[PDB]
Amino acid sequence: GIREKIKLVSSAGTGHFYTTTKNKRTKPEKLELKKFDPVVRQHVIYKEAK
Amino acid sequence: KRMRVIREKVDATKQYDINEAIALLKELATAKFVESVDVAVNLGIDARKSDQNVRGATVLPHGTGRSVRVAVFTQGANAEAAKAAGAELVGMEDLADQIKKGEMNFDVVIASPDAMRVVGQLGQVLGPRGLMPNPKVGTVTPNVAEAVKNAKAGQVRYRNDKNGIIHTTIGKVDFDADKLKENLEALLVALKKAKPTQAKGVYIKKVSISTTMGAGVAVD
Amino acid sequence: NPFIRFEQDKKLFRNALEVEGLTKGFDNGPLFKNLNLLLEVGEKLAVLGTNGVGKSTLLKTLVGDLQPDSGTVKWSENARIGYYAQDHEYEFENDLTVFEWMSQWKQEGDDEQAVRSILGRLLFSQDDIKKPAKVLSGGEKGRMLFGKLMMQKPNILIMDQPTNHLDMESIESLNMALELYQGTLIFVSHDREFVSSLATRILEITPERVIDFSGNYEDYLRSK
Amino acid sequence: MLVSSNVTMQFGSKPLFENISVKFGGGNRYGLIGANGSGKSTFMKILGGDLEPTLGNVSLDPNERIGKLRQDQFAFEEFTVLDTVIMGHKELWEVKQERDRIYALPEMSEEDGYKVADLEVKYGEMDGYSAEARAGELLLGVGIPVEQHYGPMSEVAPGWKLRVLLAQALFADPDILLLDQPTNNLDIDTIRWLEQVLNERDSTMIIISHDRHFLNMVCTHMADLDYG
RNA sequence: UUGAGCCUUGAUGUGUAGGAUAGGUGGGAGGCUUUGAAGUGUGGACGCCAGUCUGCAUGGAGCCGACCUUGAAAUACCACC
Ligand SMILES: Nc1ncnc2c1ncn2[C@@H]1O[C@H](COP(=O)(O)OP(=O)(O)OP(=O)(O)O)[C@@H](O)[C@H]1O
Ligand SMILES: Nc1ncnc2c1ncn2[C@@H]1O[C@H](COP(=O)(O)OP(=O)(O)OP(=O)(O)O)[C@@H](O)[C@H]1O
Ligand code: NA
Ligand code: NA
């Protein structure tokens, strides 16, 4: 409800994304996490964009 | 007189033929002069858009009829090559700032990376009337000898107005009607080849060949 | 409507300004020559003219950050001056929060109230008392200046051009605050029905003749 | 015609304007109102494209040269009076500043030869030969005489600082977005001069002024931005 | 009568620095003047009110262009808009 839904789009070029939830009113700031990207088979950085 | 008789003698509404027009232009012959005739083509482009501007050149088998001071204002190998290739001067800064004011002007100006002084030596007056070296035109290139050779061979350059009508040097009236064809068609072919890929619609509508003192006629 | 109210730290009695001769100049012949006048703990004297006369530099000379070529101004020994500059960019700098900027003032006040309360009396909340000071916009910066004046509590308010970026709903709030304020002030606002609203000692300034104190300024504009 | 397509902006922790969309285009003057602290200038920046929204698209006009006036009339104090106006046109000012790295760099390379060759050509296309010729005449037309053209912007009364900042936006201008044009309050003679200048020439305009009488005399629409 | 689109023709347009109300594009320096001029008197319309401008006879055939302050070059003309 209050926690909106966001997707972390991979930064390896391929189209892949993990979907989570983020409290969208504390301050606007994208999530940066290093998560596995199966298409390229490596641990890359995941910036968020819905 | 002429302005009031040629107007009724020649009608610009009817589209003439190449062979009829080349003869009629020489047939007018009202005033005595060198009669350096030229052309004007209504290109179909949007000169409002930067990328659809068509500034180019082509090497003509008849040149322009006169030679200019085509020198390479870049001291070094390019200037050394141009001096023996037949420029109007050498490349130095003595004629760019201390002589760029005293010296009136030359015909053309090529540039080289050895001494890029001409990029500011002209300032506002040297290239204010179209004397700067175009990076895409090939004037500002290391091959000073090649640039001088092209200038001697007679590469005529053309540009656009704010609406997209190209007029440029094509040759004098001293060259015969048969010789006019491998200039007109050569220029048209070069323009067609260099036409931008973003040229929507019909890009050539009207060609008009005109005299320096006489009027112009619709060729096609 | 931002609730703004200007208090008085210490009430001075005899008179405040008492200026004799300024004759301030920058490049041309001095924008004014004498401007001898008194205050008598009055109200306003709404300096005004046209653009480029030099009312802002007159106020600069009065407040003392610019000194005249030769002359004397002087204030009462108990005079506390609050200043609202025509341009205020030297103030909103050094990357402070709204809370930190508003707390850098204040004489003897608790950090949590009487400084987070003067902020809420003028359109601010918890989500806004943490944004940087150098990012607020126009009327908000002007309102912050009003808040600093409310906490400094000065006797004399110089207040160059207060109605610049206000809401047209903060304009009358400031109008009421000024007419309920019991100190001394000057201001050079160009608004018609602000000087017409409260002015009493209007002083016009011109490259040749500096008029002074016709009255309500309605009588001034009527005589003119 | 510039269009906003579901534009939202979130400053801090609460959205400023929620999912706005409206069409601007024509010889009309959409003066917009709103309490200070609520959109207005941020929406103007979004329309100008300097700042992007958190959600939505600018849906910009192709190459129609959005011409803008800023809220700050004191942000220009080091650039001279004849410098600000010529800096108003971006693609000219940027090319001029880059070409200024010729007399200041005593070393030139092979690539730099091509770059100096083509940047001068671009300057000629962008009319650098008349860049300062078209600016002084406009500055004299607005009412700023010659004596202060090369003087610094600091030594100017703000009523004339605005007079020059307005002329800074007058270079082949469709779609002029004017931020707060009064403030540093004009006498009233300058205000009527403004209103006649603005309502004589025909273009698409967006005013944000707070002056009710000025807005009445100028504008035909009111793009109020109040609730959400 | 009032709009919008097209064709043709005619009017239409400064600076900063001037002998001068210079749209570019540059082609060029010699055309233009008597199929009646230089300048004289007669006025239409426009007019950052200084001037363009064209009906007009007579007076009868010089003026212009170049140099020149200048960002630009000049109704020396024409085509392209
Ligand atoms: N970069 C920013 N980051 C966070 N908050 C901001 C930022 N810029 C402005 N704000 C705040 O969010 C709101 C947006 O300010 P904005 O510049 O849009 O105001 P405005 O309505 O145009 O004001 P004014 O009428 O005074 O010109 C204001 O309340 C301001 O305090
Ligand atoms: N530092 C300065 N150097 C030179 N001249 C200045 C300076 N400051 C101001 N002036 C000149 O003094 C005159 C008035 O300046 P001032 O800043 O006082 O204007 P003002 O009359 O208050 O107008 P406004 O506030 O509307 O800008 C103007 O002619 C201005 O050019
Ligand atoms: Na002032
Ligand atoms: Na704002």
What span, in angstroms and rounded, lies between the C-alpha atoms of B157 and B191?
11
Single-letter code of the amino acid located at D39: G
Instruction: Please answer whether residues D126 and B50 qualify as being in contact, where contact means their C-beta atoms are separated by less than 8 angstroms.
Output: no
Q: Angle CA(C190)–CA(C194)–CA(C198) in degrees, nearest 5?
A: 130
Torsion of CA A37, A39, A40, A44, to 10 degrees: -20
What span, in angstroms and rounded, lies between the C-alpha atoms of D148 and D132?
15
In angstroms, the Cα distances linking D227 to D24, D34, D42, D56, D136 are 20, 9, 15, 19, 44
Q: Of all residues in chain B, what percent are helix, strand and coil, respectively (each to 5)?
A: 30, 15, 55
The rounded radius of gyration (Å) of the Cα atoms in chain A is: 12
Give me B125's structure tokens: 């007056």
Q: What is the CA D122 to chain-centroid distance, rounded?
A: 23
Contact A27 D12 (CB under 8 A): yes
What span, in angstroms and rounded, lies between the C-alpha atoms of B51 and C26?
51
Ligand 2 contact, D184 CB (< 6 A):
yes
What is the three-class DSSP state of D90? helix
Selected residues 9-48 of chain D with any CB under 8 Å from a CB in chain B: none
Nearby residues of D164 by Cβ (< 8 Å), 6 or more positions away? D81, D84, D85, D139, D142, D144, D153, D156
Selected residues 64-93 of chain B with any CB under 8 Å from a CB in chain D: 74
E strand spans, chain B: 38-43, 56-59, 70-72, 108-110, 155-158, 165-166, 204-210, 216-218
DSSP summary character for residue D148? G
> Is C138 annotated as belonging to a binding site?
no
In angstroms, the Cα distances linking C215 to B54, C195, D213 are 71, 11, 26
Nearby residues of A19 by Cβ (< 8 Å), 6 or more positions away? A5, A6, A7, A8
Question: What residues in C contact D212, CB-CB < 8 Å?
Answer: 168
> Is D34 annotated as belonging to a binding site?
yes
User: What's the C31 CA to ligand 1 centre distance in angstroms?
Assistant: 38
Q: Is A5 exposed, middle or buried (0-12, 13-18, 19+ CB in 10 A)?
A: exposed
Breaks (C-N over 2.5 A) in chain B follow: none
Q: Angle CA(D45)–CA(D47)–CA(D48) in degrees, nearest 5?
A: 60
Determine the residue of D17, D33, D40 to mutate for testing ligand 1's pocket, defined as the one with the most ligand atoms within 8 A of the Cβ atom. Answer: D40
B37 phi, psi to nearest 5 deg: -75, 165
Resolution attained, angstroms: 3.3
Give me D66's structure tokens: 């959005």
**What count of residues does chain A have?**
50
Tokens 């970026």 sit on residue = C165
Alpha-helix runs per DSSP H in chain D: 41-48, 81-88, 90-99, 110-125, 133-142, 158-167, 189-200, 212-218
Question: What residues in D contact B53, CB-CB < 8 Å?
Answer: 125
Breaks (C-N over 2.5 A) in chain D follow: none
Beta bridge partners, D8, equal D55
> Is C130 annotated as belonging to a binding site?
no
Give me D138's structure tokens: 């406009």
For residue B40, how many other CB atoms are within 10 A of its CB? 15
Measuring CA to CA, which residue among B217, B212, B216 is closest to residue B36? B212
CA of D137, C1' of E69: distance in angstroms: 18
Chains B and C touch (3+ CB pairs under 8 A): no
Q: Is D148 exposed, middle or buried (0-12, 13-18, 19+ CB in 10 A)?
A: middle
Nearby residues of D199 by Cβ (< 8 Å), 6 or more positions away? D29, D217, D218
Determine the residue of D8, D10, D11, D183 to mutate for testing ligand 1's pocket, defined as the one with the most ligand atoms within 8 A of the Cβ atom. Answer: D11
| CA of B158: nucleotide with nearest C1' | E25
Question: What residues in C contact D222, CB-CB < 8 Å?
Answer: none
Angle between helices C170-180 and C139-152 (to 10 degrees): 20
What span, in angstroms and rounded, lies between the C-alpha atoms of B219 and B209?
7
Torsion of CA D66, D67, D71, D75, to 10 degrees: 120
D146/chain B closest Cα distance in angstroms: 22
What span, in angstroms and rounded, lies between the C-alpha atoms of A9 and A18?
7
C97 phi, psi to nearest 5 deg: -75, 165
Q: State the structure-solving technique.
A: cryo-EM
3-state secondary structure C10-61: CCCCCCCCCECCCCCCCCCCCCCCCCCECCCCCCCCCCECCCCCCHHHHHHH
D12 at A interface, C-beta within 8 A: yes
Closest CB to D187 among C50, C161, C167? C50
Sign of torsion, CA C117 C121 C126 C132? negative
Measuring CA to CA, which residue among C166, C145, C134, C172 is closest to residue D183? C166
In angstroms, the Cα distances linking D129 to B122, B130, D29, D88, D145 are 12, 11, 34, 16, 22
Give me C63's structure tokens: 């407040």
D130 at A interface, C-beta within 8 A: no
CATH of domain A1-50: 2.20.28.120
What is the three-class DSSP state of D23? strand
Residue of B nearest to D100 (CA): B120
